[PDB]
Amino acid sequence: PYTLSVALPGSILDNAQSPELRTYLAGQIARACAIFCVDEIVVFDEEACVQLARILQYLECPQYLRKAFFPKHQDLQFAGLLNPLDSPHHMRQDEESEFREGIVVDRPTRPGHGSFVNCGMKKEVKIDKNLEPGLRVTVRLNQQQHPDCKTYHGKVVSSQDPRTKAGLYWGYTVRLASCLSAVFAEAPFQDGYDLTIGTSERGSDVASAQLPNFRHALVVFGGLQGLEAGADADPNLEVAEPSVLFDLYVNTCPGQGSRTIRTEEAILISLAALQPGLIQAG
Amino acid sequence: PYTLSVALPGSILDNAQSPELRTYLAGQIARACAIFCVDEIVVFDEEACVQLARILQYLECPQYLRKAFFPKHQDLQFAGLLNPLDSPHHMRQDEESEFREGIVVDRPTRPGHGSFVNCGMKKEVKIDKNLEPGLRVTVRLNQQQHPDCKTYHGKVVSSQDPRTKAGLYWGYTVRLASCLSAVFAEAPFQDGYDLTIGTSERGSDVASAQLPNFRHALVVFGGLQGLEAGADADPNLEVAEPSVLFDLYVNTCPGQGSRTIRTEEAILISLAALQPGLIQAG
Ligand SMILES: C[S@@+](CC[C@H](N)C(=O)[O-])C[C@H]1O[C@@H](n2cnc3c(N)ncnc32)[C@H](O)[C@@H]1O
Ligand SMILES: C[S@@+](CC[C@H](N)C(=O)[O-])C[C@H]1O[C@@H](n2cnc3c(N)ncnc32)[C@H](O)[C@@H]1O
């Protein structure tokens, strides 16, 4: 199955009128990406990124694991006033699920015995492998999980498994990039992004665009000054206009009735505008 | 040229965590509609509507006219923390424009002479017709506007003119509907909405949908409980499911990775998902 990654600059957070709205905006990004089953979000420095990245990670992390993975931070002061992702890997105890994220507990194992994992279930989940504690893992529960002395049983599996195997969106990862050229180069896939797509009012009409067969797509968004800012700023990138950095450069809202479309708005519009092209090619 | 109207319930404002966010959410709606060149927004009562309607009107009104048309209200306490529409009819003095909205001043006219209008220009604009003051009008400036004794000159024209004639998006109007059946029936066009479109995760796939040639489109959105709530609530509408109220009932985001898409999010997604179908048929 193909991947989709989204890049945008942290600087959009500097545009907010309030601390509260700065947080809400971060949430808007998370949900936009969750909605379109994004696998990866890349926060890049166009000239804050740390705050945006942190918030995105907090929201993606299932709830029963936030306490463990995120100590009190001034950068999640407004956790509260968030929109939740309501994504398949966020459930309550109650819900039976095939798979469930977990943290490798830090309790006494016994010579030979796999670790304990906290999957937010009524009891801890016992597994096969002995593992380094505080590791986030993806556990697939057994079956024949008898009313066993205060332990469920299961096996750890690839975090790719709930997509490839059961068609379940299962969260995104978050990557920090120090510039726009680091967006492309510090990619997590062997052969980079088979397909790159940039966005702008002065790009080509998205209705013309013909998506090439692809394996890993990246869609890039600018902040307030467009992608021009992050192109110029980066020393490793000497272009007249940013169109040439990407396979495609699209305008996703023809005949827009506002002089501007904000980044968080543009992401929803662009990803829908593209969603059918994406599905066809991957 | 075809029209596009959007309907949604005021109740989405009751979902906000803050007074501030209640206002911001209202703004999100305005911009979504501005972006897609919406002509009409219909706020309906699914079981607040007044507050949402007011905010939408405040944002659409050009700035130089807000003071005149909107006294201090507790329902625009957070005007400040808004996103602006940046639409063609919002400019500063500075900008030369062919057309410009105005209010008919309330100054001494002379037997025979047209009114004075305030179009936010350096001088008042003198016109042809004698008109009832406090009327919002659409003025088209002349040419041969000589350095005349502290008055510009121009003619009042249809508010439809800057679209039909110069391809300029020029704002939306706002209508209150007391229920869902009032959305369709209290429509401002002789022959209603030639095409109706409702939205839901349990609608048909938007990629299949084949838009009929049309003159006036309405796209309807539910609040938190979907359109089911406003269907049931209204006494004049006895249906098992809301699909049948509309010509088309679409899911605009196939394979969504969040269990829910909020109304303000769904509007951006749906309107993009449809925008190309719309353009083809009108
Ligand atoms: C506030 S806009 C940037 C405006 C800036 N003045 C410029 O010249 O692009 C923020 C980002 O949203 C996206 N965007 C805005 N309008 C768009 C459009 N019509 N089509 C596609 N993407 C758009 C782009 O990624 C853009 O960099
Ligand atoms: C929070 S959702 C409503 C959820 C509600 N539980 C239901 O059963 O619809 C608010 C509105 O956004 C729109 N919406 C949400 N998901 C959608 C989807 N997948 N496709 C199209 N419109 C959608 C619909 O107008 C919906 O009534």
Author numbering:
A (entry chain A), B (entry chain A): 72 to 118, 138 to 372
Give the article text:
SPOUT1, also known as CENP-32 or C9ORF114, contains a putative SpoU-TrmD (SPOUT) RNA methyltransferase (MTase) domain. SPOUT1/CENP-32 localized to mitotic spindles and kinetochores, and its depletion by siRNA resulted in unusual centrosome detachment from the mitotic spindle poles, delayed anaphase onset, and chromosome segregation errors. Structural analysis confirmed that SPOUT1/CENP-32 is a SPOUT MTase with a trefoil knot fold consisting of parallel six stranded β-sheets sandwiched between two layers of α-helices that promote dimerization of the protein. Our SPOUT1/CENP-32 structures also reveal that SPOUT1/CENP-32 dimerizes via a helical segment in the catalytic domain that packs almost perpendicularly against an equivalent segment from its dimeric counterpart.
SPOUT MTases use S-adenosyl-L-methionine (SAM) as the methyl group donor for the methyltransferase reaction. To determine whether SPOUT1/CENP-32 can also bind the cofactor, SAM, and to gain further structural insights into the substrate binding site, we soaked the SPOUT1/CENP-32 crystals in a cryo-protectant solution containing a molar excess of SAM prior to freezing the crystals for X-ray data collection. These crystals diffracted X-rays beyond 2.62 Å. The SAM-bound structure of SPOUT1/CENP-32 was determined using molecular replacement. The difference electron density map calculated for the refined model showed a well-defined electron density for the bound SAM. The mode of SAM binding is similar to that of SAH, with a methyl group pointing out of the deep cofactor binding pocket. The binding of SAH and SAM is similar. E Close-up of the electrostatic surface potential of SPOUT1/CENP-32 71-376 bound to SAM showing the deep pocket formed by the trefoil knot.
